[PDB]
Amino acid sequence: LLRRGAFLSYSQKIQEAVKALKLESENRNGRSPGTQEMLRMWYELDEESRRKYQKKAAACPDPSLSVWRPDIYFASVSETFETKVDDYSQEWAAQTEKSYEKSELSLDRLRTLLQLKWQRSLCEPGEAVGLLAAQSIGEPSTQMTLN
Amino acid sequence: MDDEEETYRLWKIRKTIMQLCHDRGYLVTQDELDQTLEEFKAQFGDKPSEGRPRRTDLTVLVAHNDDPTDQMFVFFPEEPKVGIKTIKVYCQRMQEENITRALIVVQQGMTPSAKQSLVDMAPKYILEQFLQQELLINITEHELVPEHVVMTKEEVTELLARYKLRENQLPRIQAGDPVARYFGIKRGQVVKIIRPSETAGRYITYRLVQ
Amino acid sequence: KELVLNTEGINLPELFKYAEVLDLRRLYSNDIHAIANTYGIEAALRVIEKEIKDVFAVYGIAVDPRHLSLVADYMCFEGVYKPLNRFGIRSNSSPLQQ
Amino acid sequence: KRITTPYMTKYERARVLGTRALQIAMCAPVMVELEGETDPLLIAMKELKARKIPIIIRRYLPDGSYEDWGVDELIITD
Amino acid sequence: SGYLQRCIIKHLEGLVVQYDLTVRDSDGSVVQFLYGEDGLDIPKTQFL
Amino acid sequence: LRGSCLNCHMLTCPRAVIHLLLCQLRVLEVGALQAVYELERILNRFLEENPDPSASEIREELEQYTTEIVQNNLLGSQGAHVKNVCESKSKLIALFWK
Ligand SMILES: [Zn+2]
């Protein structure tokens, strides 16, 4: 939710037991009397301590369907499908631990069958999805009488 | 009653701008986008209509993170109707300090005469126009609005190369869109849109700012 | 226990000036033209989907969201909110389809 | 440089088993040992199981690019 | 409701799914980059 | 005929915009579409920096761009069938006739 940057990471954590000392200069161009002091400490006071471009990540990492297309690269599933599979692999490894059946399979292969079911369930090229979404709002729109 | 109302209102439309300059790369420190409306009274004039936070006092300029050769001015104009008379007052303040970009937070509207001569300056002065009305909300907080992020030219060609794609047959956002104007995006720049979906969790789609 | 205002008219900047009382992060409307012009086209696309689902679900019908996000991403393809009529077939390319 | 689906979709299987069944009919040379059936589709479906259909598929991308997949290369599902 | 379905049909007739998994029109125009924001089908998602 | 006259065989439309439409509808025959706003931007700039109704046939600053992005970027004369191109050209011709 909150905001991230290279210098916004620097200012709140290293420069608030430092900027909070007594300097009572004027507001130069609407800035604080201490914001110019922190930009003085940022622009010309350190070089190669710009490593907070990696502390604050330069972006989010992209999804595994934007990078690494889902029909070719295995286990490139959606981010709500990984949470479902990880919740189920946390539950299964607590209920298969004490269940006295065969249990020939483990987590490493349960995940593989769920991820290859995600991969094999991709809509194949040639699906004509436009008339499958022109009819799923066109056949139940004949059942809608006015009561 | 213009003592607490206009103080809260200028605090709000300054917090929106200092959350807007951070969202385009410009240097905004953390303690000055976490103002608590008592820091606005301790650091600014407390009575607006008397003129202690006058419309010459509130102007801020900040620099980009890459190079401080390209900056922007946040101009808060005095009169509620900015005509051509005060579109060329502030360009004299531009030329003396060598900038290219500035934002004018008009209070009740800019004239139809000056909104033509603001776009038709040159590609030299890229000047933007914001009403005070639409800077109380910060529409990039709304939980239906994606994370628009700007995109360099090195990453447009690779996404036109992955899909064997041209710029015509890519979807469009217009430049009068309320969030493309938040980021100040020209014609031609692709924006990357990270949709908080429910079928997936994130869905990257790309749009041209036409 | 979430108090929900639910007005019968639409004025977006009338409610923007009530921010310490109304949690304006979670606002909603029916009007796609009052969200495309205030909150953008990329949130006037997560309003088309909910305004189709909350028309079918009054009548008990449930439509899969993968059919609706294909209609919102077609109508908001040109940046504006186009209709699917005789005035949205002018944008098409084939004369033998028009 | 071929990056498409390794699998054979249902429309692929329809056109392959249709043309190959017409490439069994019209007195065309059959390419498997058989038992004496008389329907071209069963022949053309028992040849898909035995990796005998020699067809190349030109999977057009929307640009106009085409990849040349062989029916032998594509993993058919069971 | 012959009219509504007829219009949505003839405005979504072309939108077939391509070998790069992006839904495109009958003129190459990109509508979506993954079909339905995760790329799946409506039948084959029942047991996921 | 309602936009033309018998005395001089020309049309009564202003020639500040006929040159713009001529300059854009030869760009969109190629289908560049980045510069249907750039041509009207440079038309407005060339019309504000010096008013000149004496420019009767052509303008050199419009024609420099519409001979630059047509001679260059010439191989895409067949990728003009995109919805975004025919939408814009039917829009500009309809704004002209109306
Ligand atoms: Zn005449």
From Swiss-Prot, chain A:
Chain residue ranges for the region called Mediates the interaction with TOP2A: 1-73
Compartment list: Nucleus, Nucleolus; Chromosome
Domain topic, free-text comment: The clamps form the DNA-binding cleft.
Family of the protein in this entry: Belongs to the RNA polymerase beta' chain family.
Quaternary structure and partners: Component of the RNA polymerase I (Pol I) complex consisting of 13 subunits: a ten-subunit catalytic core composed of POLR1A/RPA1, POLR1B/RPA2, POLR1C/RPAC1, POLR1D/RPAC2, POLR1H/RPA12, POLR2E/RPABC1, POLR2F/RPABC2, POLR2H/RPABC3, POLR2K/RPABC4 and POLR2L/RPABC5; a mobile stalk subunit POLR1F/RPA43 protruding from the core and additional subunits homologous to general transcription factors POLR1E/RPA49 and POLR1G/RPA34. Part of Pol I pre-initiation complex (PIC), in which Pol I core assembles with RRN3 and promoter-bound UTBF and SL1/TIF-IB complex.
Connected disease: Acrofacial dysostosis, Cincinnati type: A form of acrofacial dysostosis, a group of disorders characterized by malformations of the craniofacial skeleton and, in some patients, the limbs. AFDCIN patients may also have structural cardiac defects and neurologic abnormalities including developmental delay, hypotonia, motor delay and seizures. AFDCIN inheritance is autosomal dominant.
Protein name: DNA-directed RNA polymerase I subunit RPA1
Organism, scientific name: Homo sapiens
Gene name per UniProt: POLR1A
Swiss-Prot record, chain B:
SUPFAM superfamilies from the UniProt entry: Eukaryotic RPB5 N-terminal domain (SSF53036), RPB5-like RNA polymerase subunit (SSF55287)
Highest taxon in the source lineage: Eukaryota
Keywords: Acetylation, DNA-directed RNA polymerase, Host-virus interaction, Isopeptide bond, Nucleus, Transcription, Ubl conjugation
Broad class of where this protein is predominantly found: nucleus
Annotated compartments: Nucleus; Nucleus, Nucleolus
Pfam families named in the record: RNA_pol_Rpb5_C, RNA_pol_Rpb5_N
Keyword Transcription attributed: yes
Molecular function terms, GO-annotated: DNA binding; DNA-directed RNA polymerase activity
Description of how the protein assembles with itself and partners: Component of the RNA polymerase I (Pol I), RNA polymerase II (Pol II) and RNA polymerase III (Pol III) complexes consisting of at least 13, 12 and 17 subunits, respectively. Pol I complex consists of a ten-subunit catalytic core composed of POLR1A/RPA1, POLR1B/RPA2, POLR1C/RPAC1, POLR1D/RPAC2, POLR1H/RPA12, POLR2E/RPABC1, POLR2F/RPABC2, POLR2H/RPABC3, POLR2K/RPABC4 and POLR2L/RPABC5; a mobile stalk subunit POLR1F/RPA43 protruding from the core and additional subunits homologous to general transcription factors POLR1E/RPA49 and POLR1G/RPA34. (Microbial infection) Interacts with HBV protein X.
Name the record gives this protein: DNA-directed RNA polymerases I, II, and III subunit RPABC1
Source organism (scientific name): Homo sapiens (Human)
Gene: POLR2E
Curated annotation (Swiss-Prot), chain D:
Domain of life according to the entry: Eukaryota
Gene Ontology cellular component list: cytosol; fibrillar center; nucleoplasm; nucleus; RNA polymerase I complex; RNA polymerase II, core complex; RNA polymerase III complex
One of the record's GO molecular function terms: DNA binding
Major site of localization recorded for this protein: nucleus
Signal peptide: none
GO annotation (BP), single: transcription by RNA polymerase I
Coiled-coil ranges from the UniProt annotation: none
Subcellular location: Nucleus; Nucleus, Nucleolus
Keywords: Acetylation, DNA-directed RNA polymerase, Nucleus, Phosphoprotein, Transcription
Subunit structure: Component of the RNA polymerase I (Pol I), RNA polymerase II (Pol II) and RNA polymerase III (Pol III) complexes consisting of at least 13, 12 and 17 subunits, respectively. Pol I complex consists of a ten-subunit catalytic core composed of POLR1A/RPA1, POLR1B/RPA2, POLR1C/RPAC1, POLR1D/RPAC2, POLR1H/RPA12, POLR2E/RPABC1, POLR2F/RPABC2, POLR2H/RPABC3, POLR2K/RPABC4 and POLR2L/RPABC5; a mobile stalk subunit POLR1F/RPA43 protruding from the core and additional subunits homologous to general transcription factors POLR1E/RPA49 and POLR1G/RPA34.
UniProt record similarity statement: Belongs to the archaeal Rpo6/eukaryotic RPB6 RNA polymerase subunit family.
Descriptive protein name: DNA-directed RNA polymerases I, II, and III subunit RPABC2
Native source species: Homo sapiens (Human)
Gene: POLR2F
Swiss-Prot record, chain E:
Superkingdom, natural source: Eukaryota
Subcellular localization, as worded in the UniProt entry: Nucleus, Nucleolus; Chromosome
Record's disease association: Acrofacial dysostosis, Cincinnati type: A form of acrofacial dysostosis, a group of disorders characterized by malformations of the craniofacial skeleton and, in some patients, the limbs. AFDCIN patients may also have structural cardiac defects and neurologic abnormalities including developmental delay, hypotonia, motor delay and seizures. AFDCIN inheritance is autosomal dominant. Leukodystrophy, hypomyelinating, 27: A form of hypomyelinating leukodystrophy, a group of heterogeneous disorders characterized by persistent deficit of myelin observed on brain imaging. HLD27 is an autosomal recessive form characterized by global developmental delay apparent from infancy, poor or absent speech, ataxic gait or inability to sit or walk, spasticity, and abnormal eye movements. Some patients have seizures. Brain imaging shows hypomyelinating leukodystrophy, cerebellar atrophy, and thin corpus callosum.
Entry text on domains: The clamps form the DNA-binding cleft.
Entry's family note: Belongs to the RNA polymerase beta' chain family.
Protein name: DNA-directed RNA polymerase I subunit RPA1
Taxonomic lineage from the root: Eukaryota, Metazoa, Chordata, Craniata, Vertebrata
Gene designation per UniProt: POLR1A
Shown residues within the full chain: 985 to 1032 of 1720
